[PDB]
DNA sequence: GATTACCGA
DNA sequence: TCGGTAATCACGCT
């Protein structure tokens, strides 16, 4: 009845059953305490082996076609949703059908990057200390602490202006005004009316072209780490999260306070270059899952793990059309009915190229039975054949 | 034969049940179009239900009720003109079923709605083709019913059969019920031969 | 010319080779009946005498 | 040794084509039957001669 | 301070031995070139002792099987 | 008041000519009216008096057309209550045998 | 004469099939427009202009250095403003100012 | 390139092949007027410039 | 398109009681009492007198031999 | 009818809308469905050109 | 069979094509018949299942108070296929007359050793389910007479092919998950479950035919004092908008750090308007009872929501366009009936009359603006999804499964070992998972212990 | 006419 | 950085 008695009844039966299954079956069987004793214990295990043996896949299946159809059906019923979501932190992340094209087609650029930032054990519960970490991530120049630029009369040429209230609620630290001299060119120190007068005692190179200085040092200021966009803080699960904007990975992971082991991303090519290919496996898988569940309608994750484990097939992730997997290695007729380009592509493989067989698009094109499905079985039969 | 209202309740004749099996009412009324009740509180077409009272009011009174936008006949004044002419204020009436004959324990709604027939009639759609005249250039069937041609199976329809696993059907459908040609081919050159 | 006969979204890979027109078909409208089983279908007797 | 769903639909397909080209039938008679329906009755009693090859 | 490992995205790798290459080759009746090829970049392989022309095993996890192996190669 | 600068005519004529066929078009939803004004251009109906002496590629004729009950006062002043299209059924709303 | 009085007219009988011109909606000729910002570059100001036939875009663009381009149709090669404006009819810099 | 299947000097067309008649059909318009095929119409104009 | 000689739901003749009906509404008399004065009881008989077009006049004169 | 010379297929999310100037000149509802859906539009019933 | 085809009956077109050769015809019959496709490979749940009348007929059969007389029981068992001998027995409540109950006419279709218990959509009182659940879990087999007549109408409980307590709605059929057609294809073959769905369908449409299911105009009607409850919500929500314009105009901005003053203003305003429409939706929903035939169609679920039945005797909410409120128009004023420089609720796209109490002409033209945004996104989005499917099929149509469990491309490069994290077909897995120990334990024990 | 991305100084 | 060019954009039916 006790521990030894049960565990070794599964151990004997084990060889057709699975490893995961074993742990599962025991931990529920033990739990039930109005207990059943011996004969129905053997009846349950000999029934669990029959359902697992009943539900294995038939050899010869056509996996790759029913993966592309069950991911392309739910995007046609993608009608309007509640675009007036009631959140604040996550902002403008292009929900719907235009996300699914951006994850399938590689597209180095992607619009609206939002990288989720999680925090460690020392910036977890402290409210205002978590704020200065988000201060350290954000970073601000001088151009966004203004509204426009007004010229002087003769020689002062510049002034700092409206407004100053970004330094009493976030705390952008008027001591940093002193700090400005860091590796700069001239760096005069004079604060009369709260703005630092910088004199330029030289000649013809800068005469009156104020507009080109707006691309130099006036814009090159980097007041804070991780030179990326704005940061929003939300309260979830007794940790503060910092839902930032943009994507600057190897700088962001080297920040004093971000927990490095858990920061998920809405980008594809950077998680492949930094964390490796098999991490970008899990970036593609976890992102198409999160789009489907938010829109109500579900797809099973056998279909997602066939596309993702085929799109990282050659060590660098590929796109899906006309430059990726169809444009990669195949028969030369397989590339003919996709990417109607053929004087680029069909006359290129005119030079030194054979073409055997063994696609699915060729044997249908030439008149042969395809290899998948029922063209996979091989028969044999003897011949006395008495009727009786 | 596709019918429709002017509110957007399109549909097709389901069947054509005789007059004897009709759920009829505690008067001489036998309905014509037994509309599905699962379509009115799903599409938000309340103007259907206001017009149904407006047909019953403006047939018993004598004068065709004005129903123009924004200045027409109001809602509440109709339901009093029906209520003093001899009927319940909301259309509902006592109805007896015609198969067995007992009052259905509900009060079935009934009115007068103006429908209109559409020209998506069925005798301009049905065609069958066993083996007809073919294309001159490819020897494949033609296009359209006026030139006696069948359907065309795009790249969607080729892939929905490979998903099953049908490889025998995929040969017989695409090439055996199509053009087949026998060709003499050389061995060591690869080019086609020439009969004479 | 030749490159537009081979190609052009209705050329001779999708237009005529890998998607072809077939024989022994029909096409008409649909209309319910809940009295036949789940895996049967009605067929008109005009289409039934030409297939 | 149970057949799959792809092997069961090929053994019937080859046996229904032999049963049309000669190949005398087992006890399958009654009263009129299309050559496809003769192969379905023979597979139920387990007297199919045709066996599969399982590459392994 | 961190590495590429100890992360909820990266599964743990290990470099095979010399006798396991032929043992894996007879289990699946394949040819050595028919395996899906990590590049010599992309830090998952570079912190191990990456030699081009070798098989490296990953032990990744799926929420519907448990643990599941998936073999790869190293190309320049 | 003493604030305005003009004064409207009847405002029941914002909409077009086949969208002025739908009675009470402020009670329905918005996509239901668009389908309704897209099917008055497809109904059958006796439209002109010279369908007999005419050669057009295909024509239609409906034997017993009827002037509708409750409608706009606009469709009296275009001519639609003189060449109409469609009849007046007497419907009922109940779920029949399937 | 073989007609009906309710026929409104407004259609030719070119070749035996009654054909009607459907009014194409222009974009206000000989006007000028102040086009939007940040599609690929900074602000542009496009226009159309035609008389007795040929129409053409004649835009006065600018990108992020203060060039003030002018666009010509034939041989496109976008030309700076002060090249053409000096070479056309005015020589004095004071006249370009005023 | 490949020395038996793709010589580079064969890329310059010294002899242009003519496609057959069965690939260039002659469509009849009303009852006796024949619309010349688009490939046929350009090949006629090639020979007059040669 | 002359008046239908039956109704469309209730089988009852109507074409004898249309041209007597309309010649007593072009005097100004209300139709609510004229249709009641004749033999019209329900409102399924009555929706097809009260809405009709009498279009036979226009088409007839156009002629085809 | 009043048609509009543009491309029939590519989306024009700001040129297929319904603008405040259409009040009393263009009908708000009549628009045929298909690829057009807002490139052919009808004049109102009280206007003058 | 009309959620696989995704069809309706407003004049569509379906094409058949006969297969001919004797190899391609015996392949069509074994591999492609309908009953093999009762569950779907995208999510496991059943796809070929009940629709509009099949759900809402099944609620009228299993209500408490559905007592059929002797002629109506005997007539419907002949119409729904089944073949039983002279056992409609035993006239369970002879209190008025000798007539049966509604549960036991449904308990002739089930096989003889089912045991299932679950809670469905109609549960309005969660406390009175608790009592039933607690007793069941401790005393595995009580007696079906005594204790089980403490039942509810939202806790389905069947044992031994006998529905003791429940009410059938869209959790036993349906285009999405119904776990009473689901548990009959994994336990009792397939060919049994084609005649469960063939006898349910004809039994259920019978009772919805001879009981009446009209829905007239009075189903949307509210008495006078309930209407005045709505108007105090619309007045003060407009007063909060008129106050929030004055806070922005005199410099009482109260800004958010991220957004600009115009974008903070629009945020706060829309939230007030949104909440106002849901608060008035709860007033109407609380009031009109669940006894007319317009909320029966909405609770159970067959072409309805509980939004568009309170969008018919209440507000119609705001009327937005891709997240912005209506702003396109003249120079600072949408229609020329409003004084310019105005950000009020009534003046910037917000209707306040029902689909019963008439829309005034600013509200109707505001309503066409929001309606054309819905029709453009049908024809735009369809062409991008159609081309996105052609990319993925034509790149992925090569992959098979070998006999030793390996997915391989045409060149012999192994793509995925031991197909799909080995190895169970998602068409026959349960909700992503594998062998389902939990259900097995309860099922196997019950039959053995029960005997 | 709009998105990209590959190619070219 | 930085400018340049092609090549791509549902299903069926009249
Ligand atoms: Mg349809
Ligand atoms: Zn030869
Ligand atoms: Zn009548």
């Amino acid at each position: 009845v006790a521990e030894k008695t049960i565990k070794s009844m599964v151990s004997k039966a084990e060889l057709p059953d699975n490893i995961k299954e074993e742990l599962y079956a025991k931990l529920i069987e033990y739990n039930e305490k109005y207990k059943l004793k011996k004969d129905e214990i053997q009846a349950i295990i000999d029934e669990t082996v029959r359902e697992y043996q009943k539900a294995l896949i038939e050899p010869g299946e056509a996996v790759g076609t029913v993966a592309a159809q069950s991911i392309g059906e739910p995007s046609t019923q993608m009608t309007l949703n509640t675009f007036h979501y009631a959140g604040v932190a996550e902002i403008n992340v292009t929900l719907g059908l235009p996300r699914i094209i951006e994850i399938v087609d590689a597209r180095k650029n992607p619009s609206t990057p939002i990288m989720t930032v999680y925090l460690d054990e020392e910036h977890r519960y402290d409210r205002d200390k978590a704020l200065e970490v988000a201060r350290r991530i954000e970073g601000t120049t001088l151009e966004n602490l203004a509204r426009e630029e007004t010229i002087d009369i003769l020689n002062m040429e510049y002034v700092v202006e409206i407004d100053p209230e970004r330094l009493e609620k976030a705390g952008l630290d008027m001591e940093k005004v002193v700090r400005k001299l860091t590796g700069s060119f001239k760096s005069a120190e004079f604060e009369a009316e709260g703005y630092t007068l910088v004199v330029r005692p030289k000649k013809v190179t800068k005469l009156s072209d104020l507009r080109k200085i707006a691309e130099k040092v006036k814009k090159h200021r980097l007041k804070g780490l991780s030179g990326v966009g704005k940061t929003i803080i939300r309260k979830e699960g007794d940790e503060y999260v910092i839902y930032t904007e943009g994507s600057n990975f190897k700088q962001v992971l080297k920040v004093p306070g971000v927990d490095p082991t858990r920061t998920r991303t809405n980008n594809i090519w950077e998680i492949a270059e930094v964390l490796g290919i098999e991490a970008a496996r899990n970036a593609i898988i976890d992102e198409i899952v999160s789009t489907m569940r938010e829109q109500g309608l579900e797809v099973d994750v056998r279909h997602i793990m066939l596309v993702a484990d085929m799109m990282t097939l050659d060590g660098v992730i590929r796109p899906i059309g006309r430059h990726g997997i169809v444009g990669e290695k195949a028969s030369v007729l397989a590339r003919a009915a996709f990417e109607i380009t053929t004087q680029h592509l069909f006359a290129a493989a005119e030079r030194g190229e054979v073409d055997p067989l063994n696609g699915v698009v060729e044997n249908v094109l030439i008149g042969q039975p395809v290899p998948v499905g029922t063209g996979i079985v091989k028969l044999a039969m003897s011949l006395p054949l008495r009727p009786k | 034969d596709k019918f429709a209202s002017r509110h957007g309740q399109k549909g097709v004749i389901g069947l054509i049940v005789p007059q004897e099996d009709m759920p009829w009412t505690e008067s001489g009324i036998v309905p014509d179009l037994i509309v599905n009740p699962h379509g009115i509180p799903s599409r938000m077409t309340v103007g259907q239900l206001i017009e149904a009272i407006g047909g019953k009011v403006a047939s018993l009174t004598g004068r065709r009720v004005d129903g123009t936008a924004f200045i027409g006949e109001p809602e509440e004044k109709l339901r009093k003109e029906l209520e003093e002419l001899g009927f319940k204020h909301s259309g509902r009436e006592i109805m007896y079923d015609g198969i067995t004959g007992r009052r259905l324990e509900a009060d079935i709604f009934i009115g007068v709605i103006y429908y209109q027939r559409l020209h998506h009639m069925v005798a301009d759609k049905m065609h069958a083709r066993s083996r007809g005249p073919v294309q001159v250039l490819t020897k494949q069937p033609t296009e359209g019913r006026a030139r006696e041609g069948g359907l065309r199976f795009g790249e969607m329809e080729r892939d929905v059969l490979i998903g099953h696993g049908a490889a025998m059907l995929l040969i017989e459908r695409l090439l055996e019920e199509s053009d087949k040609t026998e060709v003499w081919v050389c061995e060591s050159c690869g080019h086609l031969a020439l009969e004479d | 010319t030749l490159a537009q006969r081979l190609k052009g979204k209705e050329g001779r890979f999708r237009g005529n080779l890998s998607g072809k027109r077939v024989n022994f078909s029909a096409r008409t409208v649909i209309s319910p009946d809940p009295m036949i089983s789940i895996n049967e279908v009605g067929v008109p007797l005009a289409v039934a005498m030409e297939l | 040794f149970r057949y799959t769903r792809f092997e069961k639909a090929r053994i019937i397909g080859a046996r229904a084509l032999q049963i049309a080209m000669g190949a005398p039938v087992l006890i399958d008679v009654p009263e009129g039957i299309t050559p496809l329906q003769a192969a379905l009755l023979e597979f139920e009693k387990g007297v199919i001669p045709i066996t599969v090859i399982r590459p392994s | 301070e961190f590495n590429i490992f100890d992360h909820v995205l990266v599964p743990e790798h290990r470099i095979l031995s010399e006798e396991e290459k032929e043992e894996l080759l007879k289990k699946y009746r394949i040819r050595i070139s028919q395996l899906p090829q990590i590049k010599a970049s992309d830090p998952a392989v570079v912190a191990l002792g990456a030699k081009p022309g070798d098989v490296i095993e990953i032990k990744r996890k799926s929420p519907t099987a448990g643990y599941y192996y998936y073999y790869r190669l190293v190309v320049e | 008041t003493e604030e305005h600068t003009h004064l409207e005519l009847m405002p029941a004529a914002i909409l077009g000519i086949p969208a002025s066929l739908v009675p009470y078009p402020e009670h329905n939803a918005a996509p239901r009216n668009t389908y309704g004004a897209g099917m008055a251009k497809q109904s059958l109906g006796l439209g002109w008096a010279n369908f007999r002496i005419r050669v057009d590629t295909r024509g239609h004729l409906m034997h017993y057309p009827q002037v509708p009950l409750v409608n706009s006062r606009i469709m009296k002043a275009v001519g639609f209550e003189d060449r109409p299209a469609g009849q007046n059924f007497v419907v009922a709303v109940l779920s029949y045998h399937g | 004469l073989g007609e009906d009085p309710k026929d409104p007219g407004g259609y030719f009988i070119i070749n035996g099939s009654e054909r009607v011109i459907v009014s194409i909606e222009d974009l206000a000729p000989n006007k000028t427009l102040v086009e939007r910002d940040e599609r690929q570059n900074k602000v542009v100001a496009k226009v159309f202009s035609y008389r007795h036939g040929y129409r053409a875009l004649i835009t006065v663009e600018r990108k992020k250095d203060g060039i003030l381009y002018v666009t010509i149709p034939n041989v496109p090669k976008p030309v700076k403003f002060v090249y053409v404006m000096r070479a056309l009819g005015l020589l004095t810099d004071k006249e370009i100012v005023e | 390139l490949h020395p038996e299947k793709s010589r580079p000097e064969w890329m310059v067309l010294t002899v242009l092949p003519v496609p057959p008649v069965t690939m260039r059909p002659s469509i009849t318009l009303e009852s006796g007027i024949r619309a010349e095929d688009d490939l046929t119409h350009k090949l006629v104009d090639i020979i007059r410039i040669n | 398109m002359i008046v239908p000689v039956r109704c469309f739901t209730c089988g009852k003749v109507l074409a004898d009681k249309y041209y007597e009906f309309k010649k007593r509404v072009e005097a100004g008399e209300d139709p609510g009492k004229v249709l009641d004065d004749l033999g019209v009881e329900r409102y399924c008989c009555r929706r097809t007198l009260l809405s009709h077009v009498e279009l036979i006049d226009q088409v007839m004169v156009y002629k085809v031999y | 009818r009043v048609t509009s010379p543009l491309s029939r297929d590519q989306p024009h999310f700001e040129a297929r809308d319904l603008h405040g100037t259409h009040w009393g000149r263009i009908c708000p509802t009549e628009t045929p469905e298909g690829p057009n859906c807002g490139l052919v539009k009808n004049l109102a019933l009280m206007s003058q050109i | 069979v009309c959620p696989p085809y995704n069809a309706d009956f407003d004049g569509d077109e379906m094409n058949l094509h006969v297969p001919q050769t004797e190899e391609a015809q015996a392949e069509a019959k074994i591999l492609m018949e309908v009953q093999n496709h009762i569950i779907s490979p995208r999510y496991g749940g059943p796809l070929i299942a009940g629709i509009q009348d099949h759900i809402s007929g099944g609620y009228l059969l299993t209500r408490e108070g559905a007592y059929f007389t002797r002629y109506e029981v005997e007539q419907m068992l002949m119409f729904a296929g089944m073949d039983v001998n002279e056992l409609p027995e035993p006239d369970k409540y002879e209190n008025g007359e000798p007539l049966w109950s509604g549960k036991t006419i449904f308990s002739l279709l089930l096989p003889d050793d089912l045991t299932i218990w679950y809670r469905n959509k109609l549960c309005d009182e969660p406390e009175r389910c608790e009592a039933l659940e607690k007793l069941i879990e401790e005393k595995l087999i009580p007696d079906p007479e005594e204790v089980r007549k403490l039942a509810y109408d939202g806790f389905v409980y069947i044992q031994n092919g006998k529905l003791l307590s429940g009410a059938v709605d869209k959790k036993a059929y349906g285009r999405e998950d119904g776990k009473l057609l689901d548990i009959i294809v994994r336990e009792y073959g397939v060919e049994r479950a084609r005649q469960f769905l063939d006898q349910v369908t004809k039994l259920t449409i019978w009772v919805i035919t001879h009981k009446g299911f009209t829905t007239a105009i009075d189903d949307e009607d509210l008495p006078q004092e309930a209407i005045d409850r709505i108007h105090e919500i619309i007045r003060e929500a407009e007063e909060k908008v008129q106050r929030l314009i004055e806070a922005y105009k005199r410099g009482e901005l109260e800004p958010l750090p991220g957004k600009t003053l115009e974008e903070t203003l629009e945020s706060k305003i829309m939230a007030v308007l949104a909440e106002a429409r849901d608060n008035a939706g709860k007033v109407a929903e609380r009031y009109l009872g669940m006894n007319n035939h317009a909320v029966i169609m909405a609770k159970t679920g067959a072409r309805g929501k509980i939004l568009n039945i309170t969008q018919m005797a209440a507000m119609l909410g705001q009327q937005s366009i891709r997240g912005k409120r209506l702003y396109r128009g003249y120079r600072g004023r949408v229609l020329t009936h409003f004084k310019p420089g105005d950000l009020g609720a009534r003046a910037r796209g917000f209707v306040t009359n029902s689909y019963k109490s008439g829309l005034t002409p600013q509200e109707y033209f505001f309503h066409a603006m929001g309606g054309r945004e819905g029709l453009v996104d049908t024809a735009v989005r369809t062409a991008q999804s159609g081309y996105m499917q052609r990319r993925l099929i034509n790149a992925l149509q090569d992959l098979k499964v070998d006999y030793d469990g390996t997915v391989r491309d045409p060149t012999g490069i192994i793509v995925q070992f031991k197909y799909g994290e080995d190895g169970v077909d998602p068409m026959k897995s349960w909700q992503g998972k594998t062998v389902d120990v939990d259900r097995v334990i309860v099922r196997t024990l019950l039959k053995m212990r029960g005997g």
Side-chain angles (χ1 to χ4, degrees), chain G residues 1-96:
Chain G
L1 276 309
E3 209 74 24
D4 52 346
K6 300 285 106 175
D7 191 4
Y11 54 95
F12 297 98
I13 311 178
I14 286 173
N15 209 4
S17 70
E18 306 178 358
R19 299 291 287 256
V20 62
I21 284 96
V22 51
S23 64
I24 292 171
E25 192 177 8
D26 285 335
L27 209 138
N30 298 319
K31 286 286 285 183
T32 174
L33 291 179
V34 186
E35 191 67 26
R36 298 181 184 270
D37 195 4
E38 292 297 323
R39 54 178 66 88
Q40 296 180 359
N41 292 318
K42 288 291 185 70
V43 298
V44 308
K46 64 182 288 183
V47 88
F48 293 101
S49 177
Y50 57 90
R51 180 256 178 85
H52 291 167
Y54 293 160
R55 62 193 293 275
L57 284 171
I58 302 163
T59 73
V60 276
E61 308 183 353
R62 52 101 62 218
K63 58 174 69 179
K64 196 183 165 64
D65 41 359
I67 292 174
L68 193 67
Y69 269 152
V70 178
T71 306
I72 193 70
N74 195 7
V75 188
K77 293 181 174 67
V79 193
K80 294 177 72 69
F81 178 76
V82 73
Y83 284 168
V84 177
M85 188 62 202
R86 181 176 291 170
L88 191 272
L90 293 181
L91 304 175
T92 306
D93 290 332
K94 292 182 181 181
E95 295 296 325
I96 305 169

Side-chain angles (χ1 to χ4, degrees), chain K residues 79-332:
Chain K
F79 184 65
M82 66 190 74
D83 54 355
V84 301
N85 304 121
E86 47 103 23
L87 297 174
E89 294 184 357
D91 281 321
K92 296 188 76 70
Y93 284 163
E94 292 189 359
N95 295 116
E97 289 299 325
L99 43 88
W100 284 267
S101 294
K103 303 297 199 295
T104 71
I105 306 170
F106 190 76
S107 297
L108 259 67
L109 285 83
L110 308 183
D112 53 358
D113 52 352
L114 265 294
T115 299
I116 188 65
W117 41 271
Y118 66 98
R119 183 182 297 112
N120 55 3
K121 291 169 95 286
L122 298 171
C123 54
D124 295 333
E125 288 176 351
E127 195 273 333
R128 201 162 66 187
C129 291
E130 225 132 59
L132 229 194
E133 160 170 342
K134 256 29 176 259
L135 162 114
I136 275 221
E137 144 210 306
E138 265 352 285
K139 319 150 98 268
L140 288 198
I141 300 293
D143 293 332
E145 305 98 11
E146 293 78 5
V147 213
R148 289 181 180 173
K149 299 297 191 266
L150 188 78
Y152 188 66
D153 288 335
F155 191 80
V156 183
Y157 177 68
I158 305 168
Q159 78 173 9
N160 292 323
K162 182 72 185 297
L163 196 148
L164 269 307
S165 168
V168 169
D169 54 346
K170 194 245 185 66
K171 203 66 63 65
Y173 318 109
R175 188 255 179 84
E176 191 60 30
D177 48 358
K179 59 180 65 64
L180 198 269
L181 184 60
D182 195 3
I183 66 168
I184 208 166
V185 302
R186 289 95 187 273
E187 299 180 357
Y188 293 142
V190 165
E191 298 91 6
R192 180 61 184 269
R194 76 179 184 92
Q195 78 181 4
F196 171 72
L197 202 146
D198 188 74
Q199 297 175 4
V200 158
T201 285
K202 297 188 287 183
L203 201 277
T204 305
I205 304 170
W206 192 82
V207 62
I208 205 64
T209 298
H210 295 284
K211 202 67 66 69
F213 201 64
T214 182
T215 160
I217 197 167
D218 57 353
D219 295 329
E220 316 302 321
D221 191 75
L222 303 172
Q224 184 61 42
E225 59 91 14
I227 300 172
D228 297 330
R229 187 70 58 85
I230 301 169
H231 280 88
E232 60 92 16
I233 298 296
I234 317 174
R235 185 176 63 243
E236 60 91 17
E238 185 179 358
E239 293 292 325
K240 193 178 264 77
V241 170
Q242 191 65 41
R243 188 173 298 115
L244 261 291
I245 300 169
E246 293 172 352
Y248 175 74
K249 193 175 285 185
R250 71 185 65 189
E252 298 176 357
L253 65 159
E254 193 183 2
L256 294 174
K259 274 79 72 176
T260 322
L261 276 75
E262 182 68 27
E263 293 178 353
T264 59
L265 201 284
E266 292 279 4
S267 187
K268 258 136 205 287
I269 285 276
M270 285 177 189
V272 165
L273 264 65
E275 168 65 28
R277 164 263 292 269
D278 157 274
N279 208 164
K282 189 68 63 179
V283 168
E285 178 183 358
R286 191 266 311 278
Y287 200 83
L288 86 162
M290 294 70 170
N291 293 316
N292 54 354
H293 309 282
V295 192
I296 303 301
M297 286 165 54
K299 288 174 302 174
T300 70
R303 297 183 67 89
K305 298 292 287 183
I306 327 103
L307 182 59
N308 52 4
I309 210 73
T310 183
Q311 206 182 12
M312 200 178 292
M315 294 180 184
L316 313 178
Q318 70 273 15
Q319 204 62 249
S320 66
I321 182 169
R322 59 260 184 100
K324 289 294 292 182
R325 200 175 59 179
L326 292 169
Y327 64 96
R328 297 180 64 85
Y330 293 157
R331 187 60 63 92

Side-chain angles (χ1 to χ4, degrees), chain A residues 57-118:
Chain A
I57 194 164
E58 295 167 346
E61 198 74 20
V63 164
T65 306
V66 309
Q69 282 163 349
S70 300
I71 198 64
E73 179 190 4
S75 67
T76 66
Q77 296 180 0
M78 185 59 211
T79 61
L80 304 176
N81 213 173
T82 308
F83 288 99
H84 195 76
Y85 298 107
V88 180
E90 291 187 355
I91 33 101
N92 300 321
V93 70
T94 67
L95 282 312
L97 192 146
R99 183 57 191 163
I100 304 300
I101 302 170
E102 286 185 353
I103 182 68
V104 169
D105 299 333
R107 55 177 295 162
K108 299 284 187 69
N109 297 117
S111 300
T112 69
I114 293 178
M115 56 184 296
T116 301
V117 170
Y118 286 158

Side-chain angles (χ1 to χ4, degrees), chain F residues 8 13-19 34-35 37 41 74, chain J residues 1 23-24 27-31 33 43-46:
Chain F
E8 276 289 333
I14 293 300
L15 31 84
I17 160 75
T34 300
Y35 295 167
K41 302 189 287 185
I74 295 170
Chain J
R1 292 194 191 276
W23 174 264
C27 181
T29 74
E30 302 177 3
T31 291
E33 290 184 352
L43 292 175
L45 194 136
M46 37 89 77

Side-chain angles (χ1 to χ4, degrees), chain B residues 185-192:
Chain B
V185 176
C186 177
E187 286 178 355
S188 298
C189 292
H191 298 284
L192 303 180

